């Protein structure tokens, strides 16, 4: 229930990460401004699909694939994690 951190893994050149890249470029600052104390770590993948890790309390982690998503899909999926639904 208690979210502790969010991690977004997106490859910087693969076509499948194009939607996640657009979210970082034009939507990350607004998201971070709303959650100043939430660790939102953006990292880099080489040849695998993009991932969304959500570390909850007591070390529970859920990974959501972001492969071939759009910027709107990434925003909705991320706010679902923040909302809890």
């Amino acid at each position: 229930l208690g979210l502790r951190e969010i991690r977004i893994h997106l490859c910087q050149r693969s076509p499948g990460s194009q939607g996640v890249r657009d979210f970082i470029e034009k939507r990350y600052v607004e998201l971070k401004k709303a959650n100043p104390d939430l660790p939102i770590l953006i990292r880099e993948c080489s040849d695998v699909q993009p991932k969304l890790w959500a570390r909850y309390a007591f070390g529970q982690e859920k990974n959501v694939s972001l492969n071939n998503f759009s910027a709107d899909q990434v925003t909705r999926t991320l706010e679902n994690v923040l909302s809890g639904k």
Partner: protein, 689 residues
Amino acid sequence: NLIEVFVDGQSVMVEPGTTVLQACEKVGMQIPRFCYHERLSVAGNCRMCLVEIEKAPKVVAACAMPVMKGWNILTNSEKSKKAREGVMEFLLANHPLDCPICDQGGECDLQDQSMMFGSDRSRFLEGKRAVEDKNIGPLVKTIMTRCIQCTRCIRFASEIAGVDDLGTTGRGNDMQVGTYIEKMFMSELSGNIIDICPVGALTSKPYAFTARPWETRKTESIDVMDAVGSNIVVSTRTGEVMRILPRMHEDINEEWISDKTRFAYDGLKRQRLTQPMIRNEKGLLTYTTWEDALSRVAGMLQSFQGNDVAAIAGGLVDAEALVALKDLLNRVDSDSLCTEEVFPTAGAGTDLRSNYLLNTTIAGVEEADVILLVGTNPRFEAPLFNARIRKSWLHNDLKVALIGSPVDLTYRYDHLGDSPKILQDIASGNHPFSQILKEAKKPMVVLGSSALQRSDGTAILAAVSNIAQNIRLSSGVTGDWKVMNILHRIASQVAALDLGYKPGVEAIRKNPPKVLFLLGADGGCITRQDLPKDCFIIYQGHHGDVGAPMADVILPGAAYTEKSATYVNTEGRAQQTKVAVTPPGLAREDWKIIRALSEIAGMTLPYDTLDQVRSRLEEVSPNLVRYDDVEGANYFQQANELSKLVNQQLLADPLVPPQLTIKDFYMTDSISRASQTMAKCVKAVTEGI
């Protein structure tokens, strides 16, 4: 366009200005040499590299003669062989018969090239020359009867290290190399003259007489004494570290290592933690067993949870240990994970790697046009980065400007005051250096992470980000060139930030913990005065300096020479240290200690082997398993936007680096403090002579 030359009749296309030596290298033939080093200038005085051109009556110096169109280079001709034999005859005519008492011994270029290219007999029936031995400090031992006057040390000293205290005095056969006065050649890049001297005239004094080159086993690992991440080779012998040598990596190390990296390996044999220690009824530390120590620690971990659990990561910790401790502390929902070094967390913070990385890599300095250093002393924080800066300065007329304290770098730079008010002036546009940066085609701004330790580090970071923003707006937006840069001085800082540790110990100061895990934390940032009474301290480390004296439980770990581990340098590159020797006594690997503690406590971690721990590392941050890659994504726009919204006031204090002198360079970390050679160097540079 390329011109066609011939080596032994084989065609090869070389750029104009290429030398005969480099053309032969391209076709795969290594011409004998003594005074030629590719990292230094061309001298051409040993005359060992003479080769014959097909029609030329006279042999040419291969190391200095540019190739012309349609030249045939006869490398193994009769004239070439006779020239090599004559030169070797002269050299060995004046050399002394010191091979068995010479540290160079089996790794001597004079011996090898004499055995390959010279004669097997001597015609010298006269007396030899004996030269008085000079003294240039505690690190380099000079036996100058073995010098062959190749002037490599002179060229290296001046060009590379910026120190002009080496030269030749006198002339003729009585020509000598030295300082002409009782002066010590003390510099952060001194042992490289030990490496480049082709003979035994300059030899390592700590390594004197200990071993021979054929005995030693070479282990290719990396360096942990600083955040450059130099590639090194560890020479071991019968399970004992004998020597540290440079390993070529032209984007990081470039064949050189600093004196601390080279000569502090003997701190790994002193003040070592070899057995687990607990406290008896008297409060005195006594040896115990692994089972007992881990049982006590796990009992405390089961008792307490939440923000009453903290961990402080030191400067010599590895990614596997960091991630294992992070997972173990997350098993109890605790999060007081911190590193003993401060980085501004306001705005983007550690969220984007292109906010604390050195975005323009070390090799990218050679392409920069203007570089501005803010609140740092690269000569001691990162000797190889400063050597690269000096090389770029020399070979490209790079303009360097330093804001703050006027430390004596090895090159001429433009000094800008001492205060961050100048930093605000540059961003505004009042300073002339603003116009210099605007007109520069390739600017670079490097802010030292030692400046961020101040109470106003966030303001300094915001100011320099604004300067980079102004540079980007005025100059070309397009391009892969990156302006903003951060220079780190701690080996584990970047790996910890990538994993998700909170920089600085401010969180632990805010919420004092009941249980504190000092993972190699010898900095003394947090002590029992700050901690609550009866706080349980577990120090896990390899040297007993501060945390071990003040800790309740002591767990011995392994050093970098003793564990296979992962370290991330200041430019974001990841490199794996390999095992050279094994931990002494009952010492174990750090992630193994953490995993065993978790298993005893009941919150068993999901990894049992090194590959599984590295798979967890790939889960948390894949850049930690992509090793030699350095390319990454640039998020300066987002970082600057997040930094703008909150701003504070710069303090009215001058930017003074922590290290102002070479003694402050010599003593920085735990292994250096435990080293006796570093103590000798400090004594030499303080008391002189």
